[PDB]
């Protein structure tokens, strides 16, 4: 990771899909009327930390 | 085929159109032709009448006064 | 907050247009524009010249859908053919290959919207000409090295 | 608590909740409902009637339909929390909760939907390890359509803790994924969320509870916040959000923490799951010392001659004495739960086919028991009084008279329609408790009621209304098609009356229960599921028919066609041999038979007027079109007499005997007997025996049969097989598996269209009937079972199949049908049929 990867709390705005995939590495995500939303600005990944294939 | 005896009878369907009202595997009332047995008139071996299909009567159904219970 | 709405959206494939509960879904109803109407408008430009797998840019301006067929040079050649069995026997097969079109292909080369890393017409003539599987150039001519000797349209459009 | 008490609590409508359990098999529908029943203590109370139809219990097997009511009282402080509707104050502490009878039964269940459709509430069981589970989604999609507010319990927590060894933090991510994976279904199908307001089952509303259903075993978030509220001086309302686990517990600073930073001890671990883990660890390791201290800190009361035995036995008693499985379930039911008073207001559009502005519709909103009786049936269910069929019903509009004269409206009841409306009195109105009957004088809206003898005029789908202007009953959507069909015939041929009587009994008993007679004298019994059909098949054998039953196929329904030009010059002779008829057979240009069936091609149709349609559009020679004789079989049929003979003087006499032989021949197909597919037969030349004494119908009816038979064989004879439209519903990744199956079955796709297109696919496809068993299994193996099929009866399509050649694709069918009919095992040939001029 060259930089602190951050995810912005807003709709993505995706189908009734894989909420589980985000929540697996615990991006805290909910659905807010049927569009998948990110529930809070979180740093997934911190400088020099190896990006998992699932998170990539 | 009567319920008491399993005996096979041929019975006539008196008043109009009537086989259309009979429908195979329906419960039918068998009554006789008022002849002390003896086959009708010019009708071979039909000692009997039908008076009802599905408990309503044939008679009511032709005039149209009544309508057949579903099944 | 939408202000002015100049929005660009891409959709492929025009047989006639469709209309049978099909189409975008997704893009066309929260773009306010319609569902049913947008392909009826799309017929006009994919109607007479070109029924054969479009590539259509729909551009939304408030509730207006502008079906431009992105100067879809492929369709232009295919439609330049010996042409208009519409349907109910296109069915042999849409690859009907024996059509001359010298300077109507030239207009198709202009339409390819300036972009071609060109030098205009000299270069652009070669690129669409070679792209022919269907047309095989000019009536009595094959195609490949005929192209290099194109003494025609060069100055006219620059 | 007697009968009189129950009646008082019915009037009670704001404190009623009519509900269902929604779950996967084997995810503990049975265990939670047993846990509820044990703890019911007023009106149940000893592990009651979860799995009532034997082998239901033995298999554990939630087949199927009955029976629970619960009473529990409400916490004075807890009453205040209770949200819903027009300042009641959801009045007086006691709440009746009526739990109905969910089939686990992933089939999308006409029985499942029947329970659901009334269905003010739902309890959703999803298991922690196997989380969402298509099986929950399927029942939930239907529930959420029917406006179905769910409340989730994540079950089998102990499997995670004991077996898996379950990572405290790891268990939170599984909780988060799974709850939100329920919100996949809820969020999209809320019909509109926001006027359905955020149905939103998450965890800080603590509408989600945590799962020891085997160990009963109940996880309240509300329960936790109430214990900790007086300890941290903290705000019960505040604490719900703060135990909602970006809830950072920084003990050092005392810090309420939105803070995952510095290494961040989640609230749902720290204070909640950590004491729970400690009870499990300290007990299952026989640490008699540590057990003592843990029990005392949280106050663990040691309960009777049960002190005996160490770890697992101690685990059940201790977890039960802490944590109220019934109580946790019940709190969530009481507090957020579906009001019928609240509930019916929203649901109105769904329920009423008529008038939303109608007087009856307005009464259902308000739950006015002074209203026109509005009854949704529901089912007729399961009585060991198999001498009839006791109706499961709900009151939504006016009370429930013993014996009110009630107009019994069968499902397609339009009120200007005299059609099957039966006005008869209801003998008894009944509490269904669930294998027992209690007789009650009055049914208030919004209560669950049993009706007797609605049975005979209740084959299925009912609405009962004193309302002449009322307003049937949107039942229909029970479908997810009953296409899994087997023909049932008795081993006993004397047994036949008991069978037929039993078909009426099944059809009352089961609203998935479709019983129809095939054309090839077979009684078809049809289930949503292969498994639901197995269940029905057992019920007929054991109970309703008491029969001795043979279960075969479906044997299917053959039709016979003619492809080309009659080579021959086909000539018959009478048994008096003077009688000769000369005949050709033709096709059948393919749009035209379809037109006759449609029925654009009217056989009562004035021949000259309808000749024009046959001639101009159809390519009909104009004269032949006028000259149709006969449509045959039964003469509305797609097969023709064309009278190419116009001056065989004789003709006028002979026309009736020709028409008769045509009808016979057409039913009577020479190949397989074997009706009559799109053949035109053209009458040649006819040569007269002078005497019309010896133009018998006895002579001529055979000439026409023989010659038609001769014409059809030169005729290059062919068969037909039927093919069906299949609407198969997929969350997009699943579409691939549909196609894989169709390939095996040789068919044909249709079209593919998507609703709001992250929105489920509907894939439309051609499947031939004989290959289409086991559809539900094969689709589901590939999908991996997202695969939900629906299938018609679309189509009769022609095979290029020549039966005269025992090439054996068409003629195999032919040979089998002939042999049953007894019915000379081949013979097809023109030697029999032709008298050489």
Curated annotation (Swiss-Prot), chain B:
Q: Which UniProt keywords apply?
A: Cytoplasm, Endoplasmic reticulum, Hydroxylation, Ribonucleoprotein, Ribosomal protein
Molecular-function GO term, any one: structural constituent of ribosome
Provide the coiled-coil residue spans. Answer: none
What is one Gene Ontology biological process annotated in the Swiss-Prot or TrEMBL record?
A: cytoplasmic translation
User: Does the keyword section mention Ribosomal protein?
Assistant: yes
**Which compartments is it annotated to reside in?**
Cytoplasm, Cytosol; Cytoplasm; Rough endoplasmic reticulum
Can you cite an annotated GO cellular component? ribosome
* Known partners and oligomeric status: Component of the 40S small ribosomal subunit.
Q: Please state which protein family the record places this protein in.
A: Belongs to the universal ribosomal protein uS12 family.
Its name, as the record gives it, is Small ribosomal subunit protein uS12
Q: Which gene encodes it?
A: RpS23
From Swiss-Prot, chain D:
Show the catalytic activity.
GTP + H2O = GDP + phosphate + H(+)
* Signal sequence, start to end: none
Q: Does the keyword Protein biosynthesis apply?
A: yes
- Coiled coil, from the record: none
Instruction: Kindly list the GO molecular function terms attached to this UniProt entry.
Output: GTP binding; GTPase activity; ribosome binding; translation elongation factor activity
Name assigned to this protein: Eukaryotic translation elongation factor 2
The cellular location(s) given in this protein's UniProt record come to: Cytoplasm
Q: Which domain of life is it from?
A: Eukaryota
